[PDB]
RNA sequence: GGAUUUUUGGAGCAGGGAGCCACGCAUCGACCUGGUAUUGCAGUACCUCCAGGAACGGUGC
């Protein structure tokens, strides 16, 4: 696309199912409620996938920005 | 910072530098930046296994320095 | 002189496929086509992949935003 | 501030990176964060071409030239 | 080929590792004067050869005459004055 | 090969040279020996010491020598120290080291290299000289110890053995007692303890902080002791103390009371009715444990004790200093500090602008087109360039003749039509 | 021209061609090796070529000294406690000196890291069995007089002198 | 709001602090500054896998703190007022 | 700024303080702190009440901590739930 | 007051590094980042002695005049009083 | 005044077993024996090839 930046991409993905990988290898799937300037992230109906396998169903979750490796829409 | 001024004072002197990874670099300090970035020359490097090597020219990023040893020629900033 | 940010701007324009070296993790690297990026070197990658150097295995990701925290190094790949 | 690297411009260098990683190439440019552009880069050996190294992950550099 | 600060050696046993070759070369040639630097590569082109650079020119001439055909790692070395001036010499002169 | 006779000879000769040097020293300023000897007197009681009169008048026989300042006395004492080290070494190697046809045989080879034009007056002169820095008279130090510096051994507050700096230890002590009820003087009052240091301890002698402190302090006092008296054999003193430690304790703890019997030093901290139960207690599991854990500390305590005893005069001298400085005013304390400082750092032996280039109009970007599209940094510079060799060479060789009609030229083109207007 | 502290302090100091820190003590006419304390153990190499030293002795404890170039001097004897003051001595170049008897080379057996040894142009060289003697008495040497110590020579030196 | 301000009010309290490197610190706060650099007295400090050592004084770089365990008595609602 | 605390991801903390509800904090130390948020800030420093700390050592472990301050860098994740209920 | 560092200035100080080393030297200067200037500084690895009957000192190294970067500093305690010099 | 050089973290976690001695997996490097090619004027990641050897070194789990 004509330049698609970090910030708009993430904003487009609000209201959507996402999965976030953390640096530590945990993964969290849920609906992205919001993100902020520092790229802290809020998920609803979160699920946890560790070793790529469903571990725990967690609900509403804040992820501190420094933990994030990458975010994927899914 | 006061330590930074004392570092700049050691430019032109032989100094020792340990990195964050524990490699030990000894030689002449050519340039020291405000952020602790260090240009040195005619180095002896002593790795974590104990082995030595020789380098003509190096530059180490300030953040990745654990510490520096400076001459005692400087010790004599006593105001602070 | 080439400035590093500009190189990226070039990668962006070219749509060259890019391989990223991550910080303090050697066994995995990330790949994709830079669509956009920001002041923090955060990247938007398309049709992205996790590359396991040990397992020779690739994990398919699609639309990725990688935080710049992880960036060690940026290279281009012909594929 | 800028890093004082003009002296090293267009010289061949040996770069020690975190993770025990080492590459070699010609300095083509830099910014205030010490992010580098390195040309004809080689991973220590396999040729990777012109690359960007983020200053964050730069431990040490050594000139292979005078 | 006029006298030169640098001598060109060929007919060297190319099985010696590069860093060992250079260190023995330095040792052997130190007897005639300070050796400023040694250039030796193992490429196909350059293998079995080395350029030894001395601070003093008299040292280079003495080395050449005294070590002509000296057995080094099994072979008799052949020494000659280099065709050109060494980069290091040119920089040290001007 | 090498004739050992010559080597052993050279050795005895060098030894002679050194003895002669330190003897010359002891001669110019008898204090050097006297000082030393006096201290020695109180460590090895047998030592015979000179007549007091000699000591005072600073004389060895008839001539009374000039009194020297402390820094120099100490200096020369450390120099003599290294000299005695050399001597001991040579004496060692020497101990480890100790026909006609061959005579002519060698005398023949002596003909070797006849053309050796050179004057050789440097065997006994280079040695004699090696042990006797400046051009003529600036530094008392011999070439042998030319890089010997006391300030790298003594701090300024110690004044080359005059005082011992205990303020630092007062700090550490405050850190040890976990309060501030303790003043420098009360701390010194504590040190004085060193039977008292054993039966009236500042803290419980099984306390960690305390034992650590005591270790550091002990070490300091000892190093200070030998530092301030180079001339006395350190090893001798060490061994003396060690033997006193081992032999004095074993029979009765050396510490005996007519009431409580025999006390144990450091490890147990208990008395004992008779020597009998005392001996059969030195094999018990308790005493084994303690003597096996608290050995180093007990020994260090003991050293602190005996070394502080040997330094009673310095301890008193310093305590005095403390009280003085304490009773000073501001100006007084300042001037005194000045004095200590001077004593410390004294010889041991006395004899453009932009605001102007912008105003002037320079360092401003400009270019001449006719000259190599050259750059000029000032407008005044341009007139000079016009009345110039190269500028006129470009004109005249261009076919545009020189001097004053063409002055305002910039580009090559216009002056061509101007020159067509000329001719 | 005594080897003095002052002498060492004004001496050319540089990184040599084989990338080691070397101190230049050439051509001073030094007769006796002494006062090395002042180098502060900061050199990988020390060049004592073209001097008048008689005995390789007198060194302080120098942990970093790995290369000793002692060309054109008058070395006729080697000190006995060399490993105690030079533990990592790896290369010793003694070309053109005065060692005459095989037994005078005996003190080199105690230098555990000694790997490069050069004794050319010394009278001792022409003594019968000089090479085999060095190989058996200083087995830690891998290159002797710029020639590889080979297995066959080791075995041959094991027979003779066994 | 700025919670370091809250910590700066805790002079003369005794606390237990757990460090990032696992070390445990029990002592009386003499001062917290704006960088959360914390200073204490009468300190019993237990590095992970040691027996405690007692120090009359200890000064911690703020970043190395994991968390403070506060006195149960502490009246938080008072301290949270500005 | 309040708006960003109110509606942004930190509203999780803002909501927990207002309702006096429980939250589980996954923590860098591999420990989890379960309790109520008395206060929080940008960095996710927090003052916590009725904290149940849980971890593992395999053996699970826990311990009660009435009053405590958490430096926010140690935060990995903060979870709001039907936990308080 | 700002004094909490300035108080200990000139004193002998025991400083603990992030890898777990012990640097003991004379605390002469600091700054915003807590970069420290340590005169007559030694490094210890194995122990900080409290009169360990076996020995007090193993793996001690004399360093001299040291500038330590604050990034890698953990903590400091008073080791001994100022040397007078 | 939490976005690369310091203070709002890239940290976290994994070693005993067998009879003083010895050790799983992956990657890279010289490296050591034989034999074999190459005789070439340079400025260097590295450097012939063929067969055999690694009770070798470093990093990660």
UniProtKB/Swiss-Prot annotation, chain F:
GO cellular component terms, A-Z: catalytic step 2 spliceosome; nuclear speck; nucleoplasm; nucleus; spliceosomal complex; U2 snRNP; U2-type precatalytic spliceosome; U2-type spliceosomal complex
Phosphoprotein among keywords: yes
Bias type Basic and acidic residues, positions: 320-331
Key words of the record: Acetylation, Metal-binding, mRNA processing, mRNA splicing, Nucleus, Phosphoprotein, Spliceosome, Zinc, Zinc-finger
Coiled coil feature spans: none
Chain segments carrying region Disordered: 320-351
Residues found modified as N-acetylmethionine: 1
GO molecular function, one term: zinc ion binding
Main localization category: nucleus
Oligomeric form and interacting partners: Component of the 17S U2 SnRNP complex, a ribonucleoprotein complex that contains small nuclear RNA (snRNA) U2 and a number of specific proteins. Part of the SF3A subcomplex of the 17S U2 SnRNP complex which is composed of three subunits; SF3A3/SAP61, SF3A2/SAP62 and SF3A1/SAP114. SF3A associates with the splicing factor SF3B and a 12S RNA unit to form the mature 17S U2 small nuclear ribonucleoprotein complex (17S U2 snRNP). Identified in the spliceosome 'E' complex, a precursor of the spliceosome 'A' complex. Identified in the spliceosome 'A' and 'B' complexes.
Protein name: Splicing factor 3A subunit 3
Organism field: Homo sapiens (Human)
Swiss-Prot record, chain H:
GO cellular component: catalytic step 2 spliceosome; commitment complex; cytosol; methylosome; nucleoplasm; nucleus; pICln-Sm protein complex; precatalytic spliceosome
Gene Ontology BP annotations: 7-methylguanosine cap hypermethylation; mRNA splicing, via spliceosome; RNA splicing; spliceosomal complex assembly; spliceosomal snRNP assembly; U2-type prespliceosome assembly
Domain of life: Eukaryota
TM segment ranges: none
Sufficient for interaction with CLNS1A: region residues: 1-80
Segments forming domain Sm: 2-74
Keywords: Cytoplasm, Isopeptide bond, Methylation, mRNA processing, mRNA splicing, Nucleus, Repeat, Ribonucleoprotein, Spliceosome, Ubl conjugation
GO terms for MF: RNA binding; U1 snRNP binding
Record localization: Cytoplasm, Cytosol; Nucleus
Variant or mutagenesis effect after changing residue 60 to R: Loss of interaction with CLNS1A
Keyword Translocase attached: no
PTM entry text: Methylated on arginine residues by PRMT5 and PRMT7; probable asymmetric dimethylation which is required for assembly and biogenesis of snRNPs.
Keyword Cytoplasm carried by entry: yes
Note, other: In the autoimmune disease systemic lupus erythematosus, antinuclear antibodies are developed with Sm specificity.
Entry's family note: Belongs to the snRNP core protein family.
The protein's name: Small nuclear ribonucleoprotein Sm D1
Organism phylogeny: Eukaryota, Metazoa, Chordata, Craniata, Vertebrata
Residues of the full protein shown: 1 to 82 of 119
Swiss-Prot record, chain I:
Sm domain: residues covered: 10-84
Top-level taxon: Eukaryota
Keywords for this protein: Acetylation, Cytoplasm, Isopeptide bond, mRNA processing, mRNA splicing, Nucleus, Phosphoprotein, Ribonucleoprotein, Spliceosome, Ubl conjugation
Signal sequence coordinates: none
GO molecular function: RNA binding
Job description of the protein: Plays a role in pre-mRNA splicing as a core component of the spliceosomal U1, U2, U4 and U5 small nuclear ribonucleoproteins (snRNPs), the building blocks of the spliceosome. Component of both the pre-catalytic spliceosome B complex and activated spliceosome C complexes. As a component of the minor spliceosome, involved in the splicing of U12-type introns in pre-mRNAs.
Recorded family membership: Belongs to the snRNP core protein family.
Protein name: Small nuclear ribonucleoprotein Sm D2
Species of the source: Homo sapiens
Range covered out of full length: 20 to 116 of 118
UniProtKB/Swiss-Prot annotation, chain J:
Keywords annotated in UniProt: Cytoplasm, Disease variant, Intellectual disability, Methylation, mRNA processing, mRNA splicing, Nucleus, Repeat, Ribonucleoprotein, RNA-binding, Spliceosome
Chief location category: cytoplasm
GO cellular component: catalytic step 2 spliceosome; cytoplasm; cytosol; histone pre-mRNA 3'end processing complex; methylosome; nucleoplasm; nucleus; small nuclear ribonucleoprotein complex
Hydrolase found in the keyword field: no
Domain of life: Eukaryota
Domain Sm: 1-82
Gene Ontology biological process terms from the UniProt entry: 7-methylguanosine cap hypermethylation; mRNA splicing, via spliceosome; protein methylation; RNA splicing; spliceosomal snRNP assembly; U2-type prespliceosome assembly
Post-translational modification remark: Methylated by PRMT5.
Entry's localization field: Cytoplasm, Cytosol; Nucleus
One term of GO molecular function: U1 snRNP binding
Keyword Repeat belongs to the record: yes
UniProt disease annotation: Cerebrocostomandibular syndrome: A syndrome characterized by severe micrognathia, rib defects ranging from a few dorsal rib segments to complete absence of ossification, and intellectual disability.
Homology family: Belongs to the snRNP SmB/SmN family.
Remarks, miscellaneous: Patients with the autoimmune disease systemic lupus erythematosus (SLE) have autoantibodies directed against some of the individual snRNP polypeptides. The most common autoantigen is called Sm. B/b' bear Sm epitopes.
UniProt-recorded name of the protein: Small nuclear ribonucleoprotein-associated proteins B and B'
Lineage of the species this protein comes from: Eukaryota, Metazoa, Chordata, Craniata, Vertebrata
Residues of the full protein shown: 5 to 89 of 240
